[PDB]
Design a protein around this ligand. Structure first.
Ligand SMILES: O=C(O)C[C@H](NC(=O)CP(=O)(O)O)C(=O)O
Ligand SMILES: O=C(O)C[C@H](NC(=O)CP(=O)(O)O)C(=O)O
Ligand SMILES: O=C(O)C[C@H](NC(=O)CP(=O)(O)O)C(=O)O
Ligand SMILES: [Zn+2]
Ligand SMILES: [Zn+2]
Lengths: 310, 146, 146, 310, 310
């Protein structure tokens, strides 16, 4: 069997550099050599309890492209959880008697983990849980850095925006800390700083990070500028000061950047990234999006099919 | 002395004003069996220790360990007919299940019918608690609700 | 005897499973003075008793009145120089101030900065508590319950 | 000083038969020979935290007929209690530094007792507190019975409707059990029965009361048929079963009635008294309302005047 | 004619130290020897476009104690301004054809100055305009200080809470800098600091002021500890951080206090003054409120009477 075969994918914290590389090698293989009936006869649940454009559509296109069938919801209001007050435990309990895997997005931290407890032999894939994890996001991110930088080690990584609630940076930071000689630059308002629990590990793994107050004290030395959106729907009133992007990127700030340097963003972007950047060759976010198809295909293949791909 | 049992358990040396706490949390007092509690008693090494004695009861190793959170100085005496057969000292457990509450308001943990669960880790000053669910890590100080 | 102190209070005849409650409600534990607690001690009469011992401490005037409500069987013994200088049994007061919570949800008692107060009336079946604000009368069974 | 001089009129349980008698004597007196200036130079606060048509306007009319001035509100929404989060304790503390008497109607039981603790020397008059008491309704009610029956003793009184939430019938019941020989007949949906605390009282005082399933079974022997409206706004949802009136009076049911029998109703009436009842000589609810003027004029005069020589 | 005869009382910046002195002298005088008919035959409009408990009832009580009549609203919702789309300019133009003085409280700064341009001969009294001014609060505040301290000079005053939106402390500050030797200590969350326009004034007038992070650091030397409530309703969302009170006074913090020191608060208080403070001899906010009667009675008497001989 393949290492990820029938495993839940809930947090980057639970995967090893090994797991990661496997997914990336597989992704590359499928990007090259599509397998249209790899998952012929499977039925996957696409359960979204929170908003989504890229994660859901990209996950569903991938299922279709590998020959799988898809059942699900993109809104919980018309689910019996929505209207009859059923617990989520009861919801994963029955849904897990119909499909071969559950993909799910939920607004509360640890929903993905709670479902693993009530799904039986049916793997659960975390499409995002509150502000905790977003593992399949880290995957397409990793695939993109490698694709554009040529490696995953000895990278200079700047993460700007909302690091407190951005489940995307939690996951990616733990992914790259698993590699060596990675260097972190964290640019955020103090109310939205990178969680303590994340720095503590950087420290222990003896990885180097610094806080900067401007995109510009780090521009000339970064390989990757990972921008993020303020998780406006996650803040409490006490934090409404911070609703507006404190760090905005214009094509103009890309004046001292290395030539390999790419600007990534999980999307969507509000105003933290002006549209004039879209034209510069450092703009890689639409490409980043597109890769979600390969990384999300490689994942499903591994989790639902015993044997390694061709 | 204080009160001697023929069988059961003696929890000697519960740092002052923790004897009450523990009688609460580990619900040690929800039995039809003889408990003998002495609060604020001395003995050289530390001026006032709390001693709790449960008769016809024996603590495990899991249960004994949990105690490490509140009283890392403690001593559980395992009595099997008047004298002190077994003696164990608490050791930081791997995780604490069901007793605590996650301070993350958005934990799925609150809403649904699961048992709280935390992984106990050693830092410097305190013990950090990491929610099985929300994966946020807290300080032993904050977990305990105020 | 069973736990002779020089000067302190001793509550005996505490209905089983109420010993702990009282150690909490009374505020008995917010002290530095040696306390001895005996839980699930046997009673010839209605079957099991809890007994609390507090050294160098005497029970407030109200406190013994709250006992009336809770352990209406309790015997409060005063001691001085290891002697039972005085022996009191609780009697139902006329009104209970700021410890009870009016069961009437629409009482102003809840929303505003006042202390609850109830008029006590020993009936034939139970005790009747009257809310000073709402004027509704309830069974102490309903007032006192969790 | 008169007995009522500067007393708080909170609950009928706090006044004696003599107290009650002093108000009807005085009410009787102001009705015949008016006093346009007993309350000359007094400012009374009229504080309605709950809707009122009759209780507030009769009190304010009464205040002016006697030469006093009025300040107040009919809506707590524009007070600083409604918008800045002020407690009632603080509201009453400051209004009591401005006025001579405070008339208050509130949605929570015991609201008026609490005010007495913050007002100092200022008399608080309870215009109704939740489903607790309505002492000033009881004074105009006693005045109306007496006037149409000639006595407050040996009457046969029927109370119909919502007895549970009826602050009006809670007060009247306690007022008439202060007189000798009164016999009560209670007709109400089970859910809306008379609180036991009142029943316990009739019992102690060894007063004769009975429960009836119909109006009609007692029609031929009541002196007073006291109808009440279902306290829709006080009900708990489980009681929504009871929103509609179970007992409705129609001209036709007055066939059996004693000639002297009068139909009283604190008002407003929904559907419990058909309008055809209005044309019968039994209908006395509009004359009852009118009497709120003389009874409230007499209460204000006693609380505020040490000696009344009329 | 007295100096105040038919003047508009809009901003404390428009009155002199003598003007202020004439009101406390008169207030002092009406307090001892009342005048039930100075304003006999005058109709005053009381126009509250914003919630009020104290400012409106004290003014209306004051109006009646002096024999004047009152017309007005406590809710702009039923005016033709609230429902038919009428401007304030037109509202004031017509109300000014009916009444003798106009007392108005409005949500927008400068609402009261604008009224002066449409009222003609009719004096407009500002009962508060947004977070601008509150001149009538300042008159009852000066009266209370003077009365408890015996002077309005050489005092040591502390102002705590929301200094930014506090129309109350904007007026009091300008009033006391009109007296000699006053020393100010301002304690406020940074977001809620005292506007610079006021600071610029203390500076010009070379008045000694200081900013403090705690109450306690100044506790042993203030004569007056002036607390304010956080203007929740005025805050901008970025300031929601500040909704809760940063400085809370408790009986225990009065340990160090001078014996003569008094705690004032325009009221209402949320959580900034614990209720245990209420039982100390320092607590003077309820006597301060009461004094709104004498200070507002004295202002109405001067604006409307050419010569006051008392
Ligand atoms: O929402 C963002 O800012 C980050 C990230 N977004 C994405 O996954 C893309 P989408 O919400 O379209 O699925 C997420 O955490 O949801
Ligand atoms: O509301 C009723 O049915 C009875 C009674 N009604 C009255 O007082 C008349 P009003 O509401 O006009 O003052 C009440 O308790 O408020
Ligand atoms: O609102 C406050 O905190 C201060 C001040 N308050 C007062 O005038 C008291 P009131 O709102 O009852 O008239 C205000 O500026 O309106
Ligand atoms: Zn958690
Ligand atoms: Zn109550």
């Amino acid at each position: 069997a393949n290492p990820l075969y029938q495993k839940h994918i809930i947090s980057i914290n639970d995967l090893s550099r090994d797991d990661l590389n496997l997914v990336l090698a597989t992704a590359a293989k499928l990007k090259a050599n599509p397998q249209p009936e790899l998952l012929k006869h499977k039925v996957i649940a696409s359960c979204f309890f929170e908003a989504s454009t890229r994660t859901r559509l990209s996950f569903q296109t991938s299922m279709h492209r590998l020959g799988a069938s898809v059942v699900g919801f993109s809104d919980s209001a018309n689910t019996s959880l929505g209207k009859k007050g059923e617990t989520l435990a009861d919801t994963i309990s029955v849904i897990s008697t119909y499909v071969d895997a559950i993909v799910m997005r939920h607004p509360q931290e640890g929903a993905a983990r709670l479902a693993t407890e009530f799904s039986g032999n049916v793997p659960v894939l975390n499409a995002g849980d509150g502000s905790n994890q977003h593992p399949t996001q880290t995957l397409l991110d990793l695939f993109t850095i490698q694709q554009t930088e040529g490696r995953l080690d000895n990278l200079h990584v700047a993460m700007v925006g909302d690091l407190k609630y951005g489940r995307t940076v939690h996951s990616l930071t733990q992914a790259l800390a698993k590699f060596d000689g990675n260097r972190f630059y964290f640019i955020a308002p103090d109310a939205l700083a990178m969680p303590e629990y994340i720095l503590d590990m950087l420290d222990e793994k003896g990885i180097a990070w610094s806080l900067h107050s401007s995109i510009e004290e780090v521009m000339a030395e970064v390989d990757i500028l990972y921008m993020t959106r303020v998780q406006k729907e996650r803040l409490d009133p006490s934090e409404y000061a911070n609703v507006k992007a404190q760090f905005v990127l214009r094509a103009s700030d890309l004046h001292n950047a290395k030539a390999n340097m790419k600007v990534l963003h999980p999307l969507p972007r509000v105003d933290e990234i002006a549209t004039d950047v879209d034209k510069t060759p450092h703009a890689w976010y639409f490409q980043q999006a597109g890769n979600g198809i390969f990384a999300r295909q490689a994942l499903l293949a591994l989790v639902l099919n015993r044997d390694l791909v061709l | 002395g204080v009160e001697a049992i023929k069988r059961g358990t003696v929890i000697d040396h519960i740092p002052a004003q923790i004897g009450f706490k523990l009688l609460s949390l580990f619900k040690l007092t929800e039995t039809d069996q003889r408990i003998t509690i002495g609060l604020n008693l001395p003995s050289g090494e530390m001026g006032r220790k709390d001693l709790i004695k449960i008769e016809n009861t024996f603590l495990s190793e899991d249960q004994v360990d949990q105690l490490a959170l509140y009283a890392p100085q403690a001593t559980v005496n395992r009595i099997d007919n008047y004298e002190v057969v077994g003696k164990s000292r608490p050791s930081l457990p791997e995780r604490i299940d069901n007793v605590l509450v996650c301070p993350n308001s958005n934990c799925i943990s609150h809403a649904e019918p699961v048992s709280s669960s935390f992984a106990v880790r050693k830092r410097a000053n305190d013990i950090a608690l990491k929610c099985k669910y929300c994966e946020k890590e807290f300080s032993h100080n904050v977990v305990l609700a105020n």
